[PDB]
Amino acid sequence: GLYEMQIPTNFTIGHHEEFIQTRSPKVTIDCAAFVCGDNTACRQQLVEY
Amino acid sequence: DATNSALGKIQSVVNANAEALNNLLNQLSNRFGAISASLQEILTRLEA
């Protein structure tokens, strides 16, 4: 009984904050575009891969 | 016998796995070298 009042009385209420990520950007990659751009000569080799 | 959804998924799983292995197999034909994907063609055409 004393203890609950020795600890900041009247049952005072305070607060905390927290953060959880849960996600990331939906990254997508056009493999062919990455390796070769508009360069047809490149795309014509890339097809083997 | 009436386009069952589970059967759809089951066949899709089987097919997906088959594709993965076929892609790996097809990889052998890539011919990363200058002569041939066939080791035998390289070996019997080029100098040691």
mmCIF file of N, CA, C and O in Angstrom:
data_model
loop_
_atom_site.group_PDB
_atom_site.id
_atom_site.type_symbol
_atom_site.label_atom_id
_atom_site.label_comp_id
_atom_site.label_asym_id
_atom_site.label_seq_id
_atom_site.Cartn_x
_atom_site.Cartn_y
_atom_site.Cartn_z
ATOM 1 N N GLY A 1 0.829 -1.198 0.000
ATOM 2 C CA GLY A 1 0.000 0.000 0.000
ATOM 3 C C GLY A 1 0.866 1.251 0.000
ATOM 4 O O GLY A 1 0.585 2.235 -0.684
ATOM 5 N N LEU A 2 1.956 1.218 0.752
ATOM 6 C CA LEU A 2 2.828 2.369 0.757
ATOM 7 C C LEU A 2 3.575 2.441 -0.563
ATOM 8 O O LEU A 2 3.631 3.486 -1.206
ATOM 9 N N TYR A 3 4.055 1.294 -1.007
ATOM 10 C CA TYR A 3 4.857 1.125 -2.202
ATOM 11 C C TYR A 3 4.151 1.667 -3.437
ATOM 12 O O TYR A 3 4.746 2.438 -4.194
ATOM 13 N N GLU A 4 2.873 1.315 -3.643
ATOM 14 C CA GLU A 4 2.170 1.819 -4.824
ATOM 15 C C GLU A 4 2.087 3.350 -4.844
ATOM 16 O O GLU A 4 1.888 3.927 -5.902
ATOM 17 N N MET A 5 2.199 4.011 -3.684
ATOM 18 C CA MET A 5 2.189 5.466 -3.605
ATOM 19 C C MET A 5 3.616 6.019 -3.590
ATOM 20 O O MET A 5 3.869 7.135 -4.034
ATOM 21 N N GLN A 6 4.574 5.236 -3.095
ATOM 22 C CA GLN A 6 5.964 5.693 -3.092
ATOM 23 C C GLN A 6 6.366 5.902 -4.549
ATOM 24 O O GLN A 6 7.056 6.862 -4.902
ATOM 25 N N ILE A 7 5.878 5.009 -5.395
ATOM 26 C CA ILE A 7 6.049 5.082 -6.826
ATOM 27 C C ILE A 7 5.073 6.148 -7.322
ATOM 28 O O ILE A 7 3.885 5.977 -7.108
ATOM 29 N N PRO A 8 5.533 7.245 -7.968
ATOM 30 C CA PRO A 8 4.659 8.343 -8.407
ATOM 31 C C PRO A 8 3.172 8.071 -8.248
ATOM 32 O O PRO A 8 2.547 7.319 -9.011
ATOM 33 N N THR A 9 2.631 8.799 -7.274
ATOM 34 C CA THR A 9 1.287 8.663 -6.760
ATOM 35 C C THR A 9 0.200 8.951 -7.736
ATOM 36 O O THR A 9 0.425 9.433 -8.851
ATOM 37 N N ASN A 10 -1.003 8.626 -7.273
ATOM 38 C CA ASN A 10 -2.266 8.850 -7.951
ATOM 39 C C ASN A 10 -2.448 7.992 -9.196
ATOM 40 O O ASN A 10 -3.478 8.107 -9.869
ATOM 41 N N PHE A 11 -1.505 7.053 -9.406
ATOM 42 C CA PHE A 11 -1.457 6.150 -10.549
ATOM 43 C C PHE A 11 -1.322 6.936 -11.840
ATOM 44 O O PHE A 11 -1.948 6.620 -12.849
ATOM 45 N N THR A 12 -0.453 7.944 -11.809
ATOM 46 C CA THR A 12 -0.198 8.783 -12.970
ATOM 47 C C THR A 12 0.109 7.984 -14.228
ATOM 48 O O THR A 12 0.847 6.996 -14.182
ATOM 49 N N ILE A 13 -0.416 8.458 -15.361
ATOM 50 C CA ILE A 13 -0.223 7.803 -16.656
ATOM 51 C C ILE A 13 0.712 8.556 -17.602
ATOM 52 O O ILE A 13 0.591 9.768 -17.786
ATOM 53 N N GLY A 14 1.691 7.822 -18.135
ATOM 54 C CA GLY A 14 2.697 8.346 -19.057
ATOM 55 C C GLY A 14 2.657 7.591 -20.381
ATOM 56 O O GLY A 14 1.687 6.879 -20.665
ATOM 57 N N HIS A 15 3.715 7.718 -21.192
ATOM 58 C CA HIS A 15 3.684 7.052 -22.488
ATOM 59 C C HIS A 15 5.048 6.756 -23.108
ATOM 60 O O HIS A 15 6.059 7.367 -22.755
ATOM 61 N N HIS A 16 5.023 5.843 -24.083
ATOM 62 C CA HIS A 16 6.162 5.418 -24.892
ATOM 63 C C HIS A 16 5.782 5.349 -26.370
ATOM 64 O O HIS A 16 4.599 5.233 -26.714
ATOM 65 N N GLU A 17 6.775 5.363 -27.251
ATOM 66 C CA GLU A 17 6.479 5.187 -28.671
ATOM 67 C C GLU A 17 7.350 4.099 -29.256
ATOM 68 O O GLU A 17 8.502 3.930 -28.847
ATOM 69 N N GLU A 18 6.795 3.379 -30.221
ATOM 70 C CA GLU A 18 7.488 2.287 -30.896
ATOM 71 C C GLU A 18 7.244 2.304 -32.419
ATOM 72 O O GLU A 18 6.255 2.857 -32.898
ATOM 73 N N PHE A 19 8.143 1.680 -33.180
ATOM 74 C CA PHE A 19 7.961 1.567 -34.632
ATOM 75 C C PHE A 19 8.442 0.236 -35.187
ATOM 76 O O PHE A 19 9.529 -0.230 -34.834
ATOM 77 N N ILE A 20 7.619 -0.372 -36.043
ATOM 78 C CA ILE A 20 7.941 -1.634 -36.710
ATOM 79 C C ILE A 20 7.836 -1.488 -38.228
ATOM 80 O O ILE A 20 6.814 -1.025 -38.747
ATOM 81 N N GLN A 21 8.867 -1.878 -38.964
ATOM 82 C CA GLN A 21 8.857 -1.658 -40.409
ATOM 83 C C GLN A 21 7.791 -2.425 -41.218
ATOM 84 O O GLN A 21 7.027 -1.835 -41.947
ATOM 85 N N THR A 22 7.778 -3.741 -41.176
ATOM 86 C CA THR A 22 6.753 -4.584 -41.854
ATOM 87 C C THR A 22 6.822 -4.638 -43.390
ATOM 88 O O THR A 22 6.265 -5.547 -44.000
ATOM 89 N N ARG A 23 7.474 -3.683 -44.034
ATOM 90 C CA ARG A 23 7.476 -3.667 -45.496
ATOM 91 C C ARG A 23 8.624 -2.897 -46.144
ATOM 92 O O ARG A 23 9.389 -2.187 -45.491
ATOM 93 N N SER A 24 8.735 -3.053 -47.446
ATOM 94 C CA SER A 24 9.792 -2.442 -48.233
ATOM 95 C C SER A 24 9.216 -2.162 -49.601
ATOM 96 O O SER A 24 8.111 -2.618 -49.879
ATOM 97 N N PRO A 25 9.882 -1.398 -50.474
ATOM 98 C CA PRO A 25 9.377 -1.079 -51.777
ATOM 99 C C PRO A 25 9.313 -2.283 -52.668
ATOM 100 O O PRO A 25 10.179 -3.160 -52.638
ATOM 101 N N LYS A 26 8.327 -2.283 -53.535
ATOM 102 C CA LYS A 26 8.120 -3.351 -54.486
ATOM 103 C C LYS A 26 9.038 -3.217 -55.672
ATOM 104 O O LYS A 26 8.632 -2.794 -56.753
ATOM 105 N N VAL A 27 10.296 -3.514 -55.457
ATOM 106 C CA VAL A 27 11.263 -3.345 -56.518
ATOM 107 C C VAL A 27 11.113 -4.410 -57.567
ATOM 108 O O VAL A 27 11.017 -5.592 -57.244
ATOM 109 N N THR A 28 11.133 -3.999 -58.822
ATOM 110 C CA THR A 28 11.048 -4.937 -59.919
ATOM 111 C C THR A 28 12.078 -4.546 -60.947
ATOM 112 O O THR A 28 12.398 -3.362 -61.095
ATOM 113 N N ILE A 29 12.642 -5.541 -61.622
ATOM 114 C CA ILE A 29 13.678 -5.261 -62.593
ATOM 115 C C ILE A 29 13.477 -5.870 -63.958
ATOM 116 O O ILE A 29 13.383 -7.088 -64.118
ATOM 117 N N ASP A 30 13.501 -5.033 -64.973
ATOM 118 C CA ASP A 30 13.404 -5.548 -66.318
ATOM 119 C C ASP A 30 14.770 -6.025 -66.698
ATOM 120 O O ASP A 30 15.600 -5.260 -67.176
ATOM 121 N N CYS A 31 14.984 -7.307 -66.486
ATOM 122 C CA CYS A 31 16.272 -7.920 -66.704
ATOM 123 C C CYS A 31 16.842 -7.546 -68.043
ATOM 124 O O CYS A 31 17.987 -7.097 -68.125
ATOM 125 N N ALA A 32 16.068 -7.728 -69.102
ATOM 126 C CA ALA A 32 16.613 -7.440 -70.400
ATOM 127 C C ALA A 32 16.984 -5.986 -70.531
ATOM 128 O O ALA A 32 18.068 -5.703 -71.027
ATOM 129 N N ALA A 33 16.129 -5.069 -70.051
ATOM 130 C CA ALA A 33 16.415 -3.628 -70.148
ATOM 131 C C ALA A 33 17.665 -3.251 -69.383
ATOM 132 O O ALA A 33 18.376 -2.311 -69.735
ATOM 133 N N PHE A 34 17.868 -3.918 -68.260
ATOM 134 C CA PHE A 34 19.012 -3.651 -67.424
ATOM 135 C C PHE A 34 20.272 -4.006 -68.160
ATOM 136 O O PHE A 34 21.228 -3.235 -68.207
ATOM 137 N N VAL A 35 20.300 -5.198 -68.721
ATOM 138 C CA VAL A 35 21.501 -5.634 -69.383
ATOM 139 C C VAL A 35 21.745 -4.887 -70.690
ATOM 140 O O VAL A 35 22.863 -4.426 -70.951
ATOM 141 N N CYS A 36 20.700 -4.770 -71.508
ATOM 142 C CA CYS A 36 20.757 -4.101 -72.801
ATOM 143 C C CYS A 36 19.678 -3.030 -72.854
ATOM 144 O O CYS A 36 18.554 -3.281 -72.457
ATOM 145 N N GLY A 37 19.958 -1.878 -73.442
ATOM 146 C CA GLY A 37 18.911 -0.857 -73.546
ATOM 147 C C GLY A 37 18.154 -0.959 -74.868
ATOM 148 O O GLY A 37 17.439 -1.931 -75.125
ATOM 149 N N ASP A 38 18.320 0.044 -75.721
ATOM 150 C CA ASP A 38 17.651 0.065 -77.022
ATOM 151 C C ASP A 38 18.557 -0.588 -78.067
ATOM 152 O O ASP A 38 18.245 -0.699 -79.258
ATOM 153 N N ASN A 39 19.709 -1.023 -77.609
ATOM 154 C CA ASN A 39 20.698 -1.571 -78.489
ATOM 155 C C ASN A 39 20.329 -2.963 -78.950
ATOM 156 O O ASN A 39 20.664 -3.964 -78.317
ATOM 157 N N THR A 40 19.725 -3.013 -80.119
ATOM 158 C CA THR A 40 19.292 -4.260 -80.722
ATOM 159 C C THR A 40 20.415 -5.283 -80.820
ATOM 160 O O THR A 40 20.204 -6.467 -80.560
ATOM 161 N N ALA A 41 21.609 -4.844 -81.207
ATOM 162 C CA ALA A 41 22.728 -5.765 -81.352
ATOM 163 C C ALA A 41 22.996 -6.514 -80.049
ATOM 164 O O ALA A 41 23.432 -7.664 -80.059
ATOM 165 N N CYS A 42 22.754 -5.858 -78.916
ATOM 166 C CA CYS A 42 22.971 -6.450 -77.611
ATOM 167 C C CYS A 42 21.870 -7.445 -77.336
ATOM 168 O O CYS A 42 22.128 -8.587 -76.947
ATOM 169 N N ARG A 43 20.630 -7.026 -77.563
ATOM 170 C CA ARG A 43 19.482 -7.890 -77.308
ATOM 171 C C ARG A 43 19.559 -9.189 -78.099
ATOM 172 O O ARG A 43 19.164 -10.254 -77.610
ATOM 173 N N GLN A 44 20.128 -9.121 -79.291
ATOM 174 C CA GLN A 44 20.276 -10.293 -80.131
ATOM 175 C C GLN A 44 21.320 -11.278 -79.622
ATOM 176 O O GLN A 44 21.408 -12.394 -80.134
ATOM 177 N N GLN A 45 22.109 -10.895 -78.618
ATOM 178 C CA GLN A 45 23.082 -11.811 -78.057
ATOM 179 C C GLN A 45 22.460 -12.304 -76.772
ATOM 180 O O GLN A 45 22.503 -13.485 -76.442
ATOM 181 N N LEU A 46 21.834 -11.367 -76.063
ATOM 182 C CA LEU A 46 21.227 -11.612 -74.773
ATOM 183 C C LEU A 46 20.233 -12.733 -74.809
ATOM 184 O O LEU A 46 20.110 -13.482 -73.849
ATOM 185 N N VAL A 47 19.538 -12.897 -75.919
ATOM 186 C CA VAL A 47 18.573 -13.978 -76.028
ATOM 187 C C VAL A 47 19.135 -15.362 -75.633
ATOM 188 O O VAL A 47 18.405 -16.198 -75.096
ATOM 189 N N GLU A 48 20.430 -15.598 -75.819
ATOM 190 C CA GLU A 48 21.026 -16.886 -75.490
ATOM 191 C C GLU A 48 21.052 -17.134 -73.987
ATOM 192 O O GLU A 48 21.152 -18.276 -73.534
ATOM 193 N N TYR A 49 20.987 -16.054 -73.225
ATOM 194 C CA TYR A 49 21.035 -16.026 -71.779
ATOM 195 C C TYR A 49 19.651 -15.816 -71.207
ATOM 196 O O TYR A 49 19.499 -15.494 -70.022
ATOM 197 N N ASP B 1 -14.198 -33.164 -61.781
ATOM 198 C CA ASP B 1 -14.333 -33.195 -63.228
ATOM 199 C C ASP B 1 -14.978 -31.910 -63.746
ATOM 200 O O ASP B 1 -15.446 -31.854 -64.885
ATOM 201 N N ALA B 2 -14.984 -30.864 -62.914
ATOM 202 C CA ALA B 2 -15.606 -29.599 -63.271
ATOM 203 C C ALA B 2 -14.716 -28.405 -62.935
ATOM 204 O O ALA B 2 -15.096 -27.530 -62.157
ATOM 205 N N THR B 3 -13.528 -28.371 -63.528
ATOM 206 C CA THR B 3 -12.548 -27.317 -63.267
ATOM 207 C C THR B 3 -12.346 -26.985 -61.788
ATOM 208 O O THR B 3 -12.482 -25.838 -61.362
ATOM 209 N N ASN B 4 -11.961 -27.993 -61.021
ATOM 210 C CA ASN B 4 -11.698 -27.860 -59.597
ATOM 211 C C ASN B 4 -10.529 -26.920 -59.314
ATOM 212 O O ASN B 4 -9.449 -27.073 -59.896
ATOM 213 N N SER B 5 -10.725 -25.969 -58.398
ATOM 214 C CA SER B 5 -9.674 -25.009 -58.081
ATOM 215 C C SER B 5 -8.438 -25.669 -57.495
ATOM 216 O O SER B 5 -7.313 -25.294 -57.836
ATOM 217 N N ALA B 6 -8.625 -26.650 -56.613
ATOM 218 C CA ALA B 6 -7.463 -27.304 -56.039
ATOM 219 C C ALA B 6 -6.693 -28.009 -57.135
ATOM 220 O O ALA B 6 -5.472 -27.926 -57.175
ATOM 221 N N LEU B 7 -7.393 -28.661 -58.070
ATOM 222 C CA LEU B 7 -6.654 -29.357 -59.119
ATOM 223 C C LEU B 7 -5.875 -28.362 -59.953
ATOM 224 O O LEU B 7 -4.739 -28.630 -60.350
ATOM 225 N N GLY B 8 -6.456 -27.188 -60.173
ATOM 226 C CA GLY B 8 -5.781 -26.138 -60.906
ATOM 227 C C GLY B 8 -4.455 -25.828 -60.223
ATOM 228 O O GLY B 8 -3.396 -25.813 -60.866
ATOM 229 N N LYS B 9 -4.511 -25.565 -58.916
ATOM 230 C CA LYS B 9 -3.298 -25.236 -58.186
ATOM 231 C C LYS B 9 -2.317 -26.394 -58.178
ATOM 232 O O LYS B 9 -1.117 -26.193 -58.349
ATOM 233 N N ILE B 10 -2.810 -27.613 -58.043
ATOM 234 C CA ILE B 10 -1.917 -28.755 -58.005
ATOM 235 C C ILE B 10 -1.163 -28.904 -59.303
ATOM 236 O O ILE B 10 0.059 -29.069 -59.300
ATOM 237 N N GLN B 11 -1.865 -28.818 -60.422
ATOM 238 C CA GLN B 11 -1.181 -28.938 -61.688
ATOM 239 C C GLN B 11 -0.239 -27.771 -61.889
ATOM 240 O O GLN B 11 0.859 -27.946 -62.419
ATOM 241 N N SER B 12 -0.628 -26.583 -61.432
ATOM 242 C CA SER B 12 0.222 -25.422 -61.593
ATOM 243 C C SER B 12 1.539 -25.622 -60.850
ATOM 244 O O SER B 12 2.605 -25.313 -61.388
ATOM 245 N N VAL B 13 1.480 -26.194 -59.643
ATOM 246 C CA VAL B 13 2.687 -26.474 -58.879
ATOM 247 C C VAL B 13 3.572 -27.462 -59.593
ATOM 248 O O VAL B 13 4.785 -27.261 -59.710
ATOM 249 N N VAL B 14 2.973 -28.520 -60.115
ATOM 250 C CA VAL B 14 3.766 -29.507 -60.807
ATOM 251 C C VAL B 14 4.451 -28.889 -62.002
ATOM 252 O O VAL B 14 5.655 -29.084 -62.213
ATOM 253 N N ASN B 15 3.698 -28.117 -62.769
ATOM 254 C CA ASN B 15 4.240 -27.502 -63.948
ATOM 255 C C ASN B 15 5.351 -26.536 -63.602
ATOM 256 O O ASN B 15 6.392 -26.536 -64.254
ATOM 257 N N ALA B 16 5.175 -25.759 -62.541
ATOM 258 C CA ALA B 16 6.187 -24.790 -62.173
ATOM 259 C C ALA B 16 7.503 -25.458 -61.860
ATOM 260 O O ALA B 16 8.572 -24.979 -62.251
ATOM 261 N N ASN B 17 7.440 -26.584 -61.178
ATOM 262 C CA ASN B 17 8.665 -27.251 -60.825
ATOM 263 C C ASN B 17 9.323 -27.845 -62.053
ATOM 264 O O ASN B 17 10.550 -27.798 -62.203
ATOM 265 N N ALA B 18 8.514 -28.344 -62.975
ATOM 266 C CA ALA B 18 9.070 -28.890 -64.191
ATOM 267 C C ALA B 18 9.784 -27.799 -64.966
ATOM 268 O O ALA B 18 10.880 -28.017 -65.488
ATOM 269 N N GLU B 19 9.191 -26.609 -65.004
ATOM 270 C CA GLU B 19 9.797 -25.516 -65.733
ATOM 271 C C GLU B 19 11.127 -25.149 -65.129
ATOM 272 O O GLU B 19 12.095 -24.913 -65.851
ATOM 273 N N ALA B 20 11.214 -25.144 -63.805
ATOM 274 C CA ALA B 20 12.473 -24.781 -63.184
ATOM 275 C C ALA B 20 13.573 -25.727 -63.606
ATOM 276 O O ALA B 20 14.688 -25.300 -63.937
ATOM 277 N N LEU B 21 13.259 -27.012 -63.657
ATOM 278 C CA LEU B 21 14.290 -27.951 -64.019
ATOM 279 C C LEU B 21 14.616 -27.871 -65.486
ATOM 280 O O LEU B 21 15.781 -28.000 -65.866
ATOM 281 N N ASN B 22 13.621 -27.617 -66.321
ATOM 282 C CA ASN B 22 13.904 -27.519 -67.732
ATOM 283 C C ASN B 22 14.735 -26.294 -68.018
ATOM 284 O O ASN B 22 15.593 -26.319 -68.894
ATOM 285 N N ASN B 23 14.558 -25.233 -67.252
ATOM 286 C CA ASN B 23 15.375 -24.068 -67.492
ATOM 287 C C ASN B 23 16.818 -24.407 -67.190
ATOM 288 O O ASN B 23 17.724 -24.072 -67.962
ATOM 289 N N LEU B 24 17.038 -25.154 -66.115
ATOM 290 C CA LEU B 24 18.395 -25.511 -65.778
ATOM 291 C C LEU B 24 18.974 -26.401 -66.847
ATOM 292 O O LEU B 24 20.117 -26.238 -67.247
ATOM 293 N N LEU B 25 18.201 -27.348 -67.336
ATOM 294 C CA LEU B 25 18.715 -28.224 -68.367
ATOM 295 C C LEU B 25 19.063 -27.433 -69.624
ATOM 296 O O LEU B 25 20.128 -27.616 -70.212
ATOM 297 N N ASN B 26 18.180 -26.519 -70.023
ATOM 298 C CA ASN B 26 18.365 -25.718 -71.226
ATOM 299 C C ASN B 26 19.603 -24.870 -71.122
ATOM 300 O O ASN B 26 20.257 -24.570 -72.123
ATOM 301 N N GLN B 27 19.986 -24.549 -69.902
ATOM 302 C CA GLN B 27 21.167 -23.764 -69.639
ATOM 303 C C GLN B 27 22.398 -24.355 -70.277
ATOM 304 O O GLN B 27 23.312 -23.633 -70.674
ATOM 305 N N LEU B 28 22.456 -25.668 -70.374
ATOM 306 C CA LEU B 28 23.632 -26.312 -70.904
ATOM 307 C C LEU B 28 23.907 -25.910 -72.338
ATOM 308 O O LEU B 28 25.056 -25.946 -72.783
ATOM 309 N N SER B 29 22.865 -25.529 -73.072
ATOM 310 C CA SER B 29 22.997 -25.162 -74.469
ATOM 311 C C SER B 29 23.476 -23.732 -74.650
ATOM 312 O O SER B 29 23.694 -23.294 -75.777
ATOM 313 N N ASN B 30 23.624 -22.983 -73.556
ATOM 314 C CA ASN B 30 24.003 -21.579 -73.646
ATOM 315 C C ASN B 30 25.230 -21.284 -74.460
ATOM 316 O O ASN B 30 25.328 -20.205 -75.021
ATOM 317 N N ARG B 31 26.207 -22.174 -74.486
ATOM 318 C CA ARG B 31 27.388 -21.883 -75.275
ATOM 319 C C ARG B 31 28.063 -20.604 -74.839
ATOM 320 O O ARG B 31 28.213 -19.676 -75.617
ATOM 321 N N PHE B 32 28.525 -20.557 -73.601
ATOM 322 C CA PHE B 32 29.152 -19.346 -73.080
ATOM 323 C C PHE B 32 30.485 -19.094 -73.774
ATOM 324 O O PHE B 32 31.020 -17.980 -73.726
ATOM 325 N N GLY B 33 31.040 -20.167 -74.348
ATOM 326 C CA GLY B 33 32.329 -20.171 -75.019
ATOM 327 C C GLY B 33 32.214 -19.659 -76.437
ATOM 328 O O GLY B 33 31.146 -19.244 -76.873
ATOM 329 N N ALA B 34 33.326 -19.672 -77.157
ATOM 330 C CA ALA B 34 33.358 -19.170 -78.523
ATOM 331 C C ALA B 34 33.111 -20.239 -79.569
ATOM 332 O O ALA B 34 32.920 -19.922 -80.744
ATOM 333 N N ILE B 35 33.143 -21.498 -79.169
ATOM 334 C CA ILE B 35 33.005 -22.557 -80.150
ATOM 335 C C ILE B 35 31.678 -23.276 -80.066
ATOM 336 O O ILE B 35 30.834 -23.139 -80.956
ATOM 337 N N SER B 36 31.443 -23.966 -78.971
ATOM 338 C CA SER B 36 30.257 -24.784 -78.853
ATOM 339 C C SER B 36 29.915 -25.107 -77.433
ATOM 340 O O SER B 36 30.780 -25.146 -76.572
ATOM 341 N N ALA B 37 28.638 -25.344 -77.184
ATOM 342 C CA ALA B 37 28.193 -25.798 -75.875
ATOM 343 C C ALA B 37 28.629 -27.239 -75.621
ATOM 344 O O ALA B 37 28.619 -27.715 -74.483
ATOM 345 N N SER B 38 28.986 -27.948 -76.684
ATOM 346 C CA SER B 38 29.419 -29.324 -76.573
ATOM 347 C C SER B 38 30.903 -29.419 -76.308
ATOM 348 O O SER B 38 31.722 -29.102 -77.172
ATOM 349 N N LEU B 39 31.253 -29.969 -75.164
ATOM 350 C CA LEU B 39 32.646 -30.072 -74.784
ATOM 351 C C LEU B 39 33.421 -30.874 -75.802
ATOM 352 O O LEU B 39 34.594 -30.607 -76.060
ATOM 353 N N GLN B 40 32.761 -31.862 -76.383
ATOM 354 C CA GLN B 40 33.387 -32.729 -77.351
ATOM 355 C C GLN B 40 33.738 -31.958 -78.621
ATOM 356 O O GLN B 40 34.739 -32.244 -79.283
ATOM 357 N N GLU B 41 32.914 -30.980 -78.998
ATOM 358 C CA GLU B 41 33.229 -30.250 -80.212
ATOM 359 C C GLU B 41 34.406 -29.353 -79.963
ATOM 360 O O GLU B 41 35.262 -29.168 -80.819
ATOM 361 N N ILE B 42 34.493 -28.822 -78.763
ATOM 362 C CA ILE B 42 35.621 -27.972 -78.486
ATOM 363 C C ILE B 42 36.886 -28.793 -78.502
ATOM 364 O O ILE B 42 37.840 -28.501 -79.234
ATOM 365 N N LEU B 43 36.849 -29.872 -77.744
ATOM 366 C CA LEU B 43 37.977 -30.747 -77.550
ATOM 367 C C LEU B 43 38.524 -31.359 -78.832
ATOM 368 O O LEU B 43 39.736 -31.520 -78.979
ATOM 369 N N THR B 44 37.648 -31.687 -79.778
ATOM 370 C CA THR B 44 38.098 -32.312 -81.006
ATOM 371 C C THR B 44 38.312 -31.340 -82.162
ATOM 372 O O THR B 44 38.548 -31.775 -83.288
ATOM 373 N N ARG B 45 38.201 -30.039 -81.912
ATOM 374 C CA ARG B 45 38.444 -29.050 -82.952
ATOM 375 C C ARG B 45 39.641 -28.188 -82.627
ATOM 376 O O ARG B 45 40.470 -27.905 -83.492
ATOM 377 N N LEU B 46 39.750 -27.777 -81.383
ATOM 378 C CA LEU B 46 40.808 -26.879 -80.966
ATOM 379 C C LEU B 46 42.090 -27.567 -80.540
ATOM 380 O O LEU B 46 42.109 -28.763 -80.241
ATOM 381 N N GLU B 47 43.180 -26.799 -80.551
ATOM 382 C CA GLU B 47 44.472 -27.269 -80.067
ATOM 383 C C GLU B 47 44.273 -27.529 -78.590
ATOM 384 O O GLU B 47 43.373 -26.940 -78.004
ATOM 385 N N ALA B 48 45.051 -28.403 -77.976
ATOM 386 C CA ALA B 48 44.840 -28.681 -76.560
ATOM 387 C C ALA B 48 44.841 -27.425 -75.676
ATOM 388 O O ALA B 48 44.049 -27.343 -74.731
#
